Write a protein that binds this DNA or RNA. Structure first.
Length: 721
DNA sequence: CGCATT
DNA sequence: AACGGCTAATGCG
């Protein structure tokens, strides 16, 4: 299988290198015949001879146009004839492209900023990570000596740890009596020892946590300081450090540097992204943190080195465990988009869809539109109307059904053929008109993006059905990842349409999807109210909560299923309303804030989780929510708040339930102090603060839906007037 | 202007 | 390597 591609220069000519792993054998294939090129639209074909003589200079070397060739392509459906301009080296393109564009006879230029190695994968039809090859992985981490006022890597590396299927080990240059610690004489010997491990193990994947911005950079400065050749690459190269905006990225040639940090940063939402917090959230097991001060103190005093070595070992162990959990998913994402695992794992949603579209456009001989210039980019900052949000019906509701559209926005794109190549296309016999915005979309032929979206949904069904027949549980998990990633990719087209930097940006397409969405959700609401007597309690972009106030649970279920049969026969194309779930009771506090409970007694809460909060505020909110959702007792929920505020005012609440966590700082507010130093016998907490700034704000938002003000929840201080 | 829901 | 800065809008604190 293909791992990655790049290029080196030999005598001024680019040489593509294809890194492959076939039958357990690492291979490098070379291609010296791939020519870099760009397209040029000319107003007069006779002018091509003047364009061929355009020259530029890179670094003393004179840049010229090797040859030109007139080709026929499509541009947003319409046929086009453009000039394919060939060059010697891909770096010639940034040097002459501006001079070619500024030439009077040149209308515009296209596909001039596509990286050579990525242009190769697309043009050759090569797909990375495709096949049944098993990759050998190795995780690693480092521990360093830190002092407050010193430069980067001014202190030596104290330890280097690594982990794989064989277990985790630590290399250090001090005596630590642990079975997994290997003791060498110096820091230089420790680094050299690590290089031998990587060389002997020969892993296909090197797994780190923030290795892009710390580990590799620290090792590099240290090897330079000590005179060590940091050859980690399979071709004897040192790790290549690149600039990715305000951060860095590292690639180890011949292998895949899998940095878990950017991956987990996009996949899950956590308050902090320390290795300890990430591991505890994904595996549900704790991990102790050992800070730089403790490691420096332990190394200088020589006491407590077992704790530092154990921390170093756990870093490599958990990085390997997390890598084992997230790498197969990233491999399926890589194979789907058609780009290397290295790039896809570090790429944003907008870049992932663009690379998928770039490949599909090449397959269909479709000329790709350019990225926007600064002027066009400023024009695209105008926003549009989004989803519809109904103001919720106050009060507690019984027997609620949640109905929503199956993939509303992708269904709209496919059903109404929403695409820049079908937008206001004159000469068609059939059109679909977007409500409110009025954009017309030709229905005579399938559009570029709706056709790809249709192929994605078809491919997803072909992978869902292959899962059911697969006996191999490893292959089933892999297919589950591909199927999930196709759903995520399909649901990224809408946002991409309104992404100002996108090549296939189309505000008209984006606002037409939301206008159609607003129409389908609003018409279905009036339909269920007028023809079925339902009360719609709350609705967001693609779904709504409804009930029949004077009806039993079986009655509401039956009528909801009858309504579904009714509207689904009226909905066009792929649009489909579904029965998402039934809820015993629920309250809709404000827009985006609500809570429901199913027949199993599982409570689902949105917008109420909420920042640094004391355990007393979290406890009372949960107690209030439970009284309302499980007991159906709103008056009990108010008494709980009155009881809590009364206990706080009379100082009957233990200080342990008043700690606020925000390094995590654990403090308590006095009548501003770390909780370790707080003494109830000497000091007094601010009862007013914990009532007015903690308990009441957390609960008020919930009880406001039932008609209670903040004053309706404070302790009844009896004023004997 | 942050953070959450869609 | 000379592309990437992180898809959208609505709406509560």
């Amino acid at each position: 299988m293909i791992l990655d591609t790049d290029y080196i220069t030999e005598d001024g000519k680019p040489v593509i290198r294809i890194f492959k792993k076939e039958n357990g054998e690492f291979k490098i294939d070379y291609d010296r015949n791939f020519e870099p090129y760009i397209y040029a639209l000319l107003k007069d074909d006779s002018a091509i001879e003047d364009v061929k003589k355009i020259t530029a200079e890179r670094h003393g070397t004179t840049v010229r146009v090797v040859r030109a060739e007139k080709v026929k392509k499509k541009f947003l459906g319409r046929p086009i004839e453009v000039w394919k301009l060939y060059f010697t080296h891909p770096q010639d393109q940034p040097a002459i492209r501006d001079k070619i564009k500024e030439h009077p006879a040149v209308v515009d230029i296209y596909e001039y900023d596509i990286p050579f190695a990525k242009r190769y994968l697309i043009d050759k039809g090569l797909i990375p990570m495709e096949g049944d090859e098993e990759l050998k992985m190795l995780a690693f981490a480092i521990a360093t000596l830190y002092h407050e006022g010193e430069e980067f890597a001014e202190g030596p590396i104290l330890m280097i740890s690594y982990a794989d299927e064989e277990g985790a080990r630590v290399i250090t240059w001090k005596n630590i009596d642990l079975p997994y610690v290997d003791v060498v004489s110096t820091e230089k010997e420790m680094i050299k020892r690590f290089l031998k491990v990587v060389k002997e193990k020969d892993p296909d994947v090197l797994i780190t946590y923030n290795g892009d911005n710390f580990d590799f950079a620290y090792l590099k400065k240290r090897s330079e300081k000590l005179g060590v050749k940091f050859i980690l690459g399979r071709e004897g190269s040192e790790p290549k450090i690149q600039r990715m905006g305000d951060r860095f990225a590292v690639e180890v040639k011949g292998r895949i540097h899998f940095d878990l940090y950017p991956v987990i940063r996009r996949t899950i939402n956590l308050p902090t992204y320390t290795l300890e917090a990430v591991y505890e959230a994904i595996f549900g097991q704790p991990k102790e943190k050992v800070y730089a001060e403790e490691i420096a103190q332990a190394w200088e005093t020589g006491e407590g080195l077992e704790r530092v070595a154990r921390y170093s070992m756990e870093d490599a162990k958990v990085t390997y465990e997390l890598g084992k959990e997230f790498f197969p998913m990233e491999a399926q994402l890589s194979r789907l988009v058609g780009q290397s695992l290295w790039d896809v794992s570090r790429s944003s949603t907008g870049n992932l869809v663009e690379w998928f579209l770039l490949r599909k456009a090449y397959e269909r001989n479709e000329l790709a539109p350019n990225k926007p210039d600064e002027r066009e980019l400023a024009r695209r900052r105008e926003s549009y109307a989004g989803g519809y949000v109904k103001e919720p019906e106050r009060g507690l509701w019984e027997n609620i059904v949640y109905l929503d559209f199956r993939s509303l926005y992708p269904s709209i794109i496919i059903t109404h053929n929403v695409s820049p190549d079908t937008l206001n296309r004159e000469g068609c016999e059939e059109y679909d008109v977007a409500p409110q915005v009025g954009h017309k979309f030709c229905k005579d032929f399938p559009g570029f993006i709706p056709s790809l979206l249709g192929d994605l949904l078809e491919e997803r069904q072909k992978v869902k059905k292959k899962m059911k027949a697969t006996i191999d549980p490893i292959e089933k998990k892999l297919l589950d990842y591909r199927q999930r990633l196709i759903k995520i990719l399909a649901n990224s087209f809408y946002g991409y349409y309104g992404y100002a930097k996108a090549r296939w940006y189309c505000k008209e397409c984006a606002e037409s999807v939301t206008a159609w969405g607003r129409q389908y959700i609003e018409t279905t609401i009036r339909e269920i109210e007028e023809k079925f007597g339902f009360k719609v309690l709350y609705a967001d972009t693609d779904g709504f909560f409804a009930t029949i106030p004077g009806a039993d649970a079986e009655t509401v279920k039956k009528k909801a299923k009858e309504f579904l049969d009714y509207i689904n026969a009226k909905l066009p194309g792929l649009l489909e309303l579904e029965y998402e779930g039934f809820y015993k009771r629920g309250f809709f506090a404000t827009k985006k804030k609500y809570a429901v409970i199913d027949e199993e007694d599982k409570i689902t809460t949105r917008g109420l989780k909420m920042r640094d909060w004391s355990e007393i505020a979290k406890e009372t909110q949960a107690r209030v929510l439970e009284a309302i959702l499980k007991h159906g007792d709103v008056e009990e929920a108010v008494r709980i708040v009155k009881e809590v505020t009364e206990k706080l005012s009379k100082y009957e609440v233990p200080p342990e339930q008043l700690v606020i966590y925000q390094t995590v700082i654990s403090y308590i507010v006095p009548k501003a102090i770390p909780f370790d130093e707080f003494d109830p016998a000497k000091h007094k907490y601010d009862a007013g603060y914990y009532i007015e700034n903690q308990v009441l704000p957390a609960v008020e938002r919930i009880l406001r839906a039932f008609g209670y003000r903040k004053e309706d929840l404070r302790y009844q201080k009896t004023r004997q007037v």
